[PDB]
Design a protein around this nucleic acid. Sequence first.
RNA 1: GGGGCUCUCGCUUCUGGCGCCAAGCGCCCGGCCGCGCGCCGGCCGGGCGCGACCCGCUCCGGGGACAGUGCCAGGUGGGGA
RNA 2: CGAAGGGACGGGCGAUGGCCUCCGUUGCCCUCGGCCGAUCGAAAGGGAGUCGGGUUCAGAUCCCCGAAUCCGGAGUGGCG
Lengths: 241, 120, 68, 57, 50
Amino acid sequence: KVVNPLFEKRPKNFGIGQDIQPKRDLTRFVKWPRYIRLQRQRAILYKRLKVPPAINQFTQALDRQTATQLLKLAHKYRPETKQEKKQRLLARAEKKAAGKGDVPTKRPPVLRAGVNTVTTLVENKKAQLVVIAHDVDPIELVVFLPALCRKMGVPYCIIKGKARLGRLVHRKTCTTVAFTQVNSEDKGALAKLVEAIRTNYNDRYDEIRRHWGGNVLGPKSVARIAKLEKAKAKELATKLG
Amino acid sequence: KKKIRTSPTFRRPKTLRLRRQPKYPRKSAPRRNKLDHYAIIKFPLTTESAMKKIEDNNTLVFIVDVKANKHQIKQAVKKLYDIDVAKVNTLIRPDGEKKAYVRLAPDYDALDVANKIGII
Amino acid sequence: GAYKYIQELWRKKQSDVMRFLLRVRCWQYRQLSALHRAPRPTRPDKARRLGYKAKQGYVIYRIRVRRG
Amino acid sequence: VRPKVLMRLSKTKKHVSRAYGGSMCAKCVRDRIKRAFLIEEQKIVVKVLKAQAQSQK
Amino acid sequence: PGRGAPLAKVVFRDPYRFKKRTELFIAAEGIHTGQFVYCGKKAQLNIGNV
RNA sequence: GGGGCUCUCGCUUCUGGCGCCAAGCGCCCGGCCGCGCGCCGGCCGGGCGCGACCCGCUCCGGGGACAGUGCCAGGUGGGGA
RNA sequence: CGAAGGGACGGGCGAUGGCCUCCGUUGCCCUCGGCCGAUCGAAAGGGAGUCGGGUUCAGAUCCCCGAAUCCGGAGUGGCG
Ligand SMILES: [Mg+2]
Ligand SMILES: [Mg+2]
Ligand SMILES: [Mg+2]
Ligand SMILES: [Mg+2]
Ligand SMILES: [Mg+2]
Ligand SMILES: [Mg+2]
Ligand SMILES: [Mg+2]
Ligand SMILES: [Mg+2]
Ligand SMILES: [Mg+2]
Ligand SMILES: [Mg+2]
Ligand SMILES: [Zn+2]
């Protein structure tokens, strides 16, 4: 057609010693600072050593679909903010002398947060469900709660997120959340999750206690012990038959 | 992707540095200009080699402060004597203080300026 | 309370749960400087029975000392 | 002249009106012209002889 | 100075950005200025190559 | 004609030269025109993708539970007191 | 054994102060980047550009007179 004949492909090539290299993505090879390397080599080192089952058990958290329905239920039971607590008590304390008097008012069943609160609840069977976060960074504060909730016999679930439990108690993070009494309009939602949780945690907990974790190798190490196998496993089966 | 590291080096990224806006000044008032026009010029020289330079060379000679430069001397003579200055030469004496040979313009002459000052 | 369980777990420093944590933290603490602020106490129960509260104005520094 | 007085001179007193003038002498400018010609002309007969050697298997 | 052996100031072409890189190779006996030296596993077995 | 399973995943060796800051092929979007029948005709700008294969968990290679360090024990020790 | 560049005409998103036609600035965004080591260290090393005559009881390549020269600044253009 009528295209300009002065338009011309000049294809440069990128062999060795030829025209120089382009700006390709070097993101594997860069000099990272020593807080980034510190936390990437830390995450590799939790899968190179034998991780005991009291630390392994916070990896097999609850599935993404059925932990979402838990948070959808535990959203009506979030503790109140002070900005609703102050606005109530300007009218709730107003209703003593005008004109109720006692006003017992039936303290609503809400969530109870904190690992020191919810441990008191399970030791005397108050709890109904113990929601536990998986990535407490000093991971020794909840390493006894799957042990303790099995012996007391309440259901417990590991939930993928610490700041997602914290975002429903109006703080930054929250370690554990415990369900106690529930309203009668949605008690049936508890007898949908509890028999679906404790088949994963309580009914199989002797299985967890010998289920060691970690102890896999690098992708370079696991693929160098596949060439030595496939070199061995190409004539040793051919020797027979 | 679509971020790309086209360098092997992690450089520290630049952040938002903002100017100060303090809740109170650290000093209550700006300090007074204690080297003013009257603190530049202390006293003239009336020596036999100073009067010999007022006549033949068309220049005044003062004893100035040691802290002053040739620009402050040229402005202080211009203010509190109402005379214009061509150039200023300065030296620090072995006495310790600084002598200034201020040369006037060819418009003026120092013989009828020293009459008004009264050093003659 | 759950501070009574942390107090008994740190009395089990040779157990296979606790020797794993005391090696992965000792690796992590070796890769940092000798003067280093911690953003929170590593032992939140041992700190608070020595005078630590979770208020503003109480800070934690991690110190590395050559032994011998 | 000295290098710091070389900035108060005009432009024609510091170079020669020629490509690479003022940096190289004319003897090696004459060589680098016929190096860049004859090497790239050699890379034509290198390129054609291996492209026209497409008669075998 | 104080080493009694010549050095070869060898200028390479930088393969990643447009620059020239000079070097200070130990002079193998028989090299001369203006010849090409080749560094790498595909270099030929000649005097001066690496 | 094609595959299998190993070569091939490499493009630079007559010369004291030049080499970066993208061409090209696209997929869109704007600004007017004006086809005023839409992947669509005329002029100016801006972006993105392939060109420059895809994933991955250590920057790469060499050692390695040794060396080394901490502590204690035996020797040796006018080097020194 | 460090996240060690706070810079860059330009490009541009513009908050927009105005001889708001713009045009000097301004902040951030996209774009580019090793004086790779703070700093000190020579009145004999490196280091742009001043000489002639005259002058004082004592000063001069420094003061007078006469000839120059270098560096920096010129947006409101200083004219060719
Ligand atoms: Mg002086
Ligand atoms: Mg010339
Ligand atoms: Mg080895
Ligand atoms: Mg001895
Ligand atoms: Mg002795
Ligand atoms: Mg730098
Ligand atoms: Mg100095
Ligand atoms: Mg000097
Ligand atoms: Mg000198
Ligand atoms: Mg003398
Ligand atoms: Zn030559």
